[PDB]
Amino acid sequence: NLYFQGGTMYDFEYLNGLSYTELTNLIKNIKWNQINGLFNYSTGSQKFFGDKNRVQAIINALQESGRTYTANDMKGIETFTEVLRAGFYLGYYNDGLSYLNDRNFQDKCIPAMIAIQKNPNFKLGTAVQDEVITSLGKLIGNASANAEVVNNCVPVLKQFRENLNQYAPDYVKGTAVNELIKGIEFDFSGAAYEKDVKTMPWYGKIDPFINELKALGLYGNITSATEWASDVGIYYLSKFGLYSTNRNDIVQSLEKAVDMYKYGKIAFVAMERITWDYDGIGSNGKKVDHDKFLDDAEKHYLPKTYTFDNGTFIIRAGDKVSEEKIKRLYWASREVKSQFHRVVGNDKALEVGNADDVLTMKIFNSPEEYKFNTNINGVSTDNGGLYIEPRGTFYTYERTPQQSIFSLEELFRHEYTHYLQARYLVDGLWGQGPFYEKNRLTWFDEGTAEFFAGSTRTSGVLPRKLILGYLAKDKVDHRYSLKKTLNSDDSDWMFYNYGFAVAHYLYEKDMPTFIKMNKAILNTDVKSYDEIIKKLSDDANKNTEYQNHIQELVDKYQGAGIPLVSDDYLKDHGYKKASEVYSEISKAASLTNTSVTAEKSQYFNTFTLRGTYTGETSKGEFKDWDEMSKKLDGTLESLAKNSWSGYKTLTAYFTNYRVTSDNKVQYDVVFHGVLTDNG
């Protein structure tokens, strides 16, 4: 025990020495944080809260300041309450203060609570009055409540309701009511943990309170600013509704919430409350179909369906997403796909009968509307969009330039690449096999995505201006070495931008290593991949190359752009007899043993042409790849010189590089374009 302070910071050793009179008066005019280690379990605090007479003194003093507080003076009610909250907290966690855990002791706070409630100043209004309510709600949270106490909250709820449009948007006002409700609910739920809810002092005695929550929940005229309040109303209507004699009446109000706000946030909550709090049984006594409700909700937000490639590529979209966009996205998928197969060298899906056999894209009208996707489909919506491979489904939304740096096409070009990685490159589950036991592909998965997003029809892969722009930052470190980028647990957001630079670097400056790397992933050769990463990491030379290549990108930024699909794709091409197109493409590409498939879409038809290409004597694999790129891009360009508009829709790739017994270069070649001949 001590009998001196120093510095307006107070120790328990010192507080323990004071008479109760002196103590309670001190607490009235100090902030709670001024008490040192207040929430800490000490011999000091043990001694302080261990005295049943002292805490009772603290309770009595709070009861007195509850009787006397005014709009201008709070009479330390905040401090009194924080001190008590500390009592109960330590009593919960530490034996020796366990008498503080007993609900029977906690009830000793009720007379103080009532005192606060009977004060004519127990109303929302000024900062003091509001803080008093906030403090009360938190104390109930740690202590106890009566049916009597709860019902005294009724005027405050009415006052809030009657002033919803002013009060709910106010942080302090809104926090007060929320703290009060949440506080009471926490105490009540705690007391009934595994006990029969029917045997509670307050059960059936809180009808006025419940009725006050119905009114909030079923307010109707919500805005963005006031929605949370009615949300609280519904959520806590369900919670307190448990202490009503009429179950079916409570569920009726919840079902009304669903009808009143539909496919908005509060209907989802109300619906959750029925299944979780009320056994998913309605007011009529029959099982509410939660699954149908979610299906109804998805149909409301995603009413439009667009089908491509014989139903293997489906877009479900909001009513406001442009049809032009839909088409552009399809053609964008085609551009990225052709570049991807070129580099990777495989177009045959790795597994049979996976969900990605059909690609599905769900595009909400807006970021606002997008949020209900987590509700509807159980996925995070804290993103610009998301590909879920086990579902073969991409979720995103249409967006304005102000809403996102990325347009919808760009984001799709990026995410689409993950669909390609998972289907055609990485065997088994994406993110969950041998290649993921160690953290080997983080740079690669994200880097190749940014990279392939820049695919074009006839120019290969180009850097996107936006990523080039990012690279324009601090040269002096901050810039990653080759070794750092390849070997990421946290890193700053720039990590992905350097991953891109590596991918681009390898593509432009070192195709041989790019191909070797992809073949390793493709063949599931974890050892070859690790060896390649090792050589690159250990070789200071490749790093210097990479460092200057970063500079080269930074320089290219001035005149760069975003590779996006051409308006040419949307043009009315008109008729062209199918057989002429095939012959024309076969001659110009020198294809052999060709075959074709025609596919039906929502707005057009398409064909896929497959042929063998065999050229002259091989100049090595990587030189072969380079020339094949140039020879093929050249064919696509010259074909566009023809009068038929449809050649401008063509995309092409090659796969399965090999050499003949006579060292002649040999590839599988694929062309894709619009088809305008029915027969």
Rounded Cα gap, residues 587 and 585, in angstroms: 6
Question: In the chain, where are the structural domains located?
Answer: 1-565, 566-678
Rounded Cα gap, residues 313 and 395, in angstroms: 14
Length of the chain: 679
Chain breaks in the chain (C to N over 2.5 A) after: 488
Cβ contact 339:573 at 8 Å: no
Instruction: Give the DSSP per-residue string, 83-96.
Output: HHHHHHHHHHHSTT
Closest CA to 321 of 263, 408, 415, 380: 408
Rounded Cα gap, residues 327 and 674, in angstroms: 12
Helix (H) or strand (E) holding 293: helix 290-301
Rounded Cα gap, residues 45 and 591, in angstroms: 87
Angle at 331 between CA 583 and CA 429, to 5 degrees: 105
Closest CA to 80 of 1, 123, 138, 127: 138
Cβ contact 648:569 at 8 Å: yes
CA-to-CA separations, 21 to 17, 81, 149, 387, 462, in angstroms, rounded: 12, 17, 28, 66, 79
Chain centroid to CA 535: 37
Give catalytic status of residue 415 as yes or no: yes
Instruction: Count CB atoms within 10 A of the CB of residue 613.
Output: 18
Is 422 annotated to bind a ligand? Reply is yes
Is 288 annotated to bind a ligand? Reply is no
Rounded Cα gap, residues 545 and 504, in angstroms: 12
> Token match 């994406």: residue?
430
Q: What is the DSSP letter of 401?
A: T
Closest CA to 138 of 76, 194, 195, 80: 80
Is 573 annotated to bind a ligand? Reply is no
**Residue 566 in 3-state DSSP?**
coil
Domain 566-678 has CATH 3.30.980.50: yes
**Residue 512 in 3-state DSSP?**
helix
How many helices (DSSP H) and strands (DSSP E) are in the chain?
Answer: 30, 9
Annotated catalytic residue within 323, 415, 437, 616 = 415
Chain centroid to CA 476: 34
- What one-letter code names the amino acid at 509? K
Q: What is the DSSP letter of 458?
A: S
